[PDB]
Structure 1
Amino acid sequence: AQRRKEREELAQQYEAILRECGHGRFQWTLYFVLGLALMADGVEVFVVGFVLPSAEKDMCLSDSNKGMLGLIVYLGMMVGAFLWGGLADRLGRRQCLLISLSVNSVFAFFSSFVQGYGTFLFCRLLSGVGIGGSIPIVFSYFSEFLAQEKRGEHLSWLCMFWMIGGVYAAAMAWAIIPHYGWSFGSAYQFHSWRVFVLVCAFPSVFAIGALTTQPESPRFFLENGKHDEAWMVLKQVHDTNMRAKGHPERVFSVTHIKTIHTWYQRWGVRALSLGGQVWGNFLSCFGPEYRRITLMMMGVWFTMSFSYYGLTVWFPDMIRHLQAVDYASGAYMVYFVSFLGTLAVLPGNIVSALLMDKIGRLRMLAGSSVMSCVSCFFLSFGNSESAMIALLCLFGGVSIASWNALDVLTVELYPSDKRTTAFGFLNALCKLAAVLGISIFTSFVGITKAAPILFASAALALGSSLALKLPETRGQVLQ
């Protein structure tokens, strides 16, 4: 009872202080810094989705060792998302993001020098574990600096870096290793998979370097009884914004902010305390206040991720089938399709950013889910490569807005002390949905076109039906 009152006062005062600080240079600099980490995450997603499965053909492997790489790295990403999301509520957003990016970079670097398939599997699994935690931490970290007036608009532009990371991975795959033999022979002669792996690790290193310059989230400090650090961070934000805008004479007027109050044996007891706190935070999401919201968010996230990652493997096989049919009358195609998808998402991002705070998160999510279902059903009517590409671009452009709205809802539906835990759980569920979608839609290669399309459309329809029951968060202070 007392704690809820104190946290409500803290949220109100934090929104007032964010309004006093304003929006400007600091927020955009942090936006680029966190976009670097999102770009690294997109690079890893593309590498798991397209590079490794094609490389498995070159690396002669048994029938048992066909799906192995992608499956196990996605499982590592699923584990890491939950782990780092849980730890971010206890150690801090910046600290856990730095640790996860360091793990990802170190093991991506190590994977280049391996001389075995199993060692490469191990290194890439650990790299996936490191990279899994980026999205929840990045989104919560950036949201805790945005006022309620335009938080949704500024959060909607974060996925462009994920798209750019996918495009960068596709371009580097096409350039460094086009139709080459992935063997553990390459001799690191530039056109090598080792060189490709080394180049793919640059965004993570740059993200670490940039993130070392940014301050920890002051909301985390306030929620954990660190008044002075949060005050210093807020003063830094205010001074940066006012100096950038040409008003260095303005003085930060905030005085006091509401605050909430052998070696291996010690490490063990501290780690047990951390684990207990993380488990308690996870179990709190299924309490009487948040259980229904958690279940509905789980359903919507699972359906959207399942449909998207099913289509990501269904579409290239359909393109290959159409090309074969035309002929009977690789990497560059994937890169071109990724570039076109990144271009087509941009109008959807513009519309979502401009309408999120104007019409609300619920209407955006519902309309975009309905349009995504309609476009997924429309995908079945294409009968040529160009028509299929245009329909997929339309589907992506209409569907990205639902993802943006769901990110905003996930940020705003949970309290600050458990936001990253809930987001990490939902992102791990999304990774599981991606695994299931890829595995199931791979079995559909030999059957027909219509059935996978109908399956994905039904999943999107279920997600749209579930989206209607979520509560609206527009106009509220950040919990």
Structure 2
Amino acid sequence: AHQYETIMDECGHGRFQWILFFVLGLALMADGVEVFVVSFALPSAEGMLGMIVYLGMMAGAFILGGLADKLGRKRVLSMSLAVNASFASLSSFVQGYGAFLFCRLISGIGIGGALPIVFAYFSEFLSREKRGEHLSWLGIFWMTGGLYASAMAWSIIPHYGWGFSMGTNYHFHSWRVFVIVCALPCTVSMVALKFMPESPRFLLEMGKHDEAWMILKQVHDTNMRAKGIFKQVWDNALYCVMGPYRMNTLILAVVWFAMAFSYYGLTVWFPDMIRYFQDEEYKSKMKVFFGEHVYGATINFTMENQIHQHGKLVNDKFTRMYFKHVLFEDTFFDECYFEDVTSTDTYFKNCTIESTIFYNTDLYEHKFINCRFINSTFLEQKNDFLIYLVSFLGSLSVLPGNIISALLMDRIGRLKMIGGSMLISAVCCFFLFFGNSESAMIGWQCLFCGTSIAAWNALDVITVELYPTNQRATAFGILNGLCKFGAILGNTIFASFVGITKVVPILLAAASLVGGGLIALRLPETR
């Protein structure tokens, strides 16, 4: 390892490592856009039914994550991103929600094993001394992914309900083109990976040292010109946990679970909380009507946000109008006529409806509660942009917090950084309680995010520096699967805990971060 390290040090940093860094940041962008399309696109397409794809990611992170250490890093990444791109393109040309969700699940299977492979790949190419910086830089691509995936989303599909609707025409296919275009970074990465070579350290590990010498010579020449078996893989995974690597992996798993719990809970909690705040503000408004006697009136316009009590609507007529958030209680209709009336959230209660006609309407049976009809009849019957905006802003908030981690991890360390960041984020979380406003929420959101990226970067480096080239991939893979696990958890609890309480989720979050930021310290030093 000494001679390989020395020759890699002599190779230095130049054109080749930058080109590889770009063609790998493409895959990290693909991972980011997958996280976005699973956490803010499917849940608004239908609820958290699509989340199951996260579970699929888990399997990928263990199936395509641990396999690479026994088979290869370029081949495994090639296959994984190829299957992701192919099945996403197939998902684009799909009719029905079930087939689309299955295609998304297999795409998640394919992509969930990309992050461990890309990090392990790039870790065997850069100089030992200048290792923390460049790896850290790669992280930003991940975040950029979400930003891009958000920025385009509100431009293409700012209309919820596109998932559970197949009776529409061949138009309204904005979701189809969105799914097509979200597979762009992975497609460009697949185009690019034909030129990049395999991992030199892994290739030397397997054998054929002449090929390793050839790739080392090619890297050196490029830099000079610029400057002028599943049994084996399961036993390998067990060798990463219940063996010499026992305490380190346990601590790393705890830290990864804690961060992927708190972060992936809050990132989805914040847009939900802002929507709930807007909903609470809206509900505060209503016209109460008592003792009406409406005689011979033809209604044509739209009346909204009203309640009627003890009304006596005699010989009325509702034709070609919109009912919006209007309630009827104890109202006595009489020979009224309903024609081409379209209703939303309206509900009739205890009403006596007599001699009416409901022709060409959507006022179904379920809109009537404890109502008595008399001589009546029933004839033939018929943007959440902010969310995306909020998401974008959050993803964007970490960019400044990343550079300040990029050119600093070689000074403070790889253990102090994560510890501090986690603890600092937990403090910010404890200030949330105080905040109660649109500006307040997004401010807190941004703040948290900005201080919640150094940790992730430190985490990535510490988890890729510890294990050797013969357990790295496998190890990274399982920690990524566990990260995907924490994601599901936070994105489920925090999500469900909206409009019932605020302290509980926040306290919970704070606790997790504290816990992780206190256990992170008990880790082998790597400098």
Q: If the length of structure 2 is used for normalisation, what is the TM-score? A: 0.79
Q: Partners of 1:316 and 1:27 in 2: how far apart?
A: 38
Q: Select the residue among 421, 437, 444 that pairs with 1:368.
A: 421
* Structure 1 residue 189, shift from structure 2 partner: 4.1
Q: Select the residue among 43, 63, 67 that pairs with 2:48.
A: 67
Q: Partners of 1:185 and 1:124 in 2: how far apart?
A: 21
Matched residue, 2:237: 282
The RMSD of aligned alpha carbons is: 1.5
Matched residue, 2:491: 438
Superposed counterparts of 1:126-141, under 5 Å: 126-141=106-121
* Structure 1 residue 20, shift from structure 2 partner: 0.7
Q: Partners of 1:334 and 1:445 in 2: how far apart?
A: 15
Query: Hey, which of these two has a bigger chunk of strand by percent?
Result: 2
Equivalent residue of 1:358, what SS?
A: coil
Equivalent residue of 1:154, what SS?
A: helix
Could you tell me which amino acid in structure 1 is paired with residue 103 of structure 2? C
Could you tell me which amino acid in structure 1 is paired with residue 224 of structure 2? M
Change (3 A) 1:287 1:448: closer
Could you tell me which amino acid in structure 1 is paired with residue 187 of structure 2? V
Superposed counterparts of 1:84-123, under 5 Å: 84-123=64-103
Contact preservation (8 Å) 1:306, 1:436: yes
User: Are 2:218 and 1:236 equivalent residues in the alignment?
Assistant: yes
Contact preservation (8 Å) 1:188, 1:194: no
Contact preservation (8 Å) 2:276, 2:499: no
**Greater mean alpha carbon deviation, residues 382-391 or residues 120-129:** 382-391
Could you tell me which amino acid in structure 2 is paired with residue 134 of structure 1? A
Q: Select the residue among 334, 346, 370 that pairs with 2:399.
A: 346
Change (3 A) 1:378 1:225: same
Equivalent residue of 1:361, what SS?
A: coil
Q: Partners of 1:331 and 1:219 in 2: how far apart?
A: 48
* Structure 1 residue 336, shift from structure 2 partner: 2.4
Identity of aligned residues (%): 69
User: Are 2:56 and 1:76 equivalent residues in the alignment?
Assistant: yes
Contact preservation (8 Å) 2:24, 2:189: yes
User: Are 2:438 and 1:385 equivalent residues in the alignment?
Assistant: yes
Contact preservation (8 Å) 2:272, 2:495: no
Contact preservation (8 Å) 1:188, 1:195: no
Query: Hey, which of these two has a bigger chunk of helix by percent?
Result: 1
Matched residue, 2:322: none
Contact preservation (8 Å) 2:147, 2:396: no
User: Are 2:476 and 1:423 equivalent residues in the alignment?
Assistant: yes
Superposed counterparts of 1:201-350, under 5 Å: 201-246=183-228, 274-328=229-283, 330-350=383-403
Change (3 A) 1:395 1:358: same
Q: If the length of structure 1 is used for normalisation, what is the TM-score? A: 0.86
Q: Select the residue among 35, 46, 58 that pairs with 2:36.
A: 46
Could you tell me which amino acid in structure 2 is paired with residue 49 of structure 1? S
Could you tell me which amino acid in structure 2 is paired with residue 240 of structure 1? T
Contact preservation (8 Å) 2:58, 2:484: yes
Question: Which of 1 and 2 has greater Rg?
Answer: 2
Superposed counterparts of 1:390-401, under 5 Å: 390-401=443-454
Equivalent residue of 2:410, what SS?
A: helix
* Structure 1 residue 147, shift from structure 2 partner: 1.4
Change (3 A) 1:101 1:186: farther
Q: Partners of 1:472 and 1:331 in 2: how far apart?
A: 46
* Structure 1 residue 196, shift from structure 2 partner: 1.1
Could you tell me which amino acid in structure 2 is paired with residue 391 of structure 1? W
Matched residue, 1:149: 129
Relative contact order (C-alpha < 8 Å, sep 6+): which is higher?
A: 1
Matched residue, 1:460: 513
Q: Which runs of 5+ in 2 are unaligned?
A: 285-382
Q: Partners of 2:110 and 2:67 in 1: how far apart?
A: 13
Could you tell me which amino acid in structure 2 is paired with residue 31 of structure 1? F
Contact preservation (8 Å) 1:111, 1:124: yes
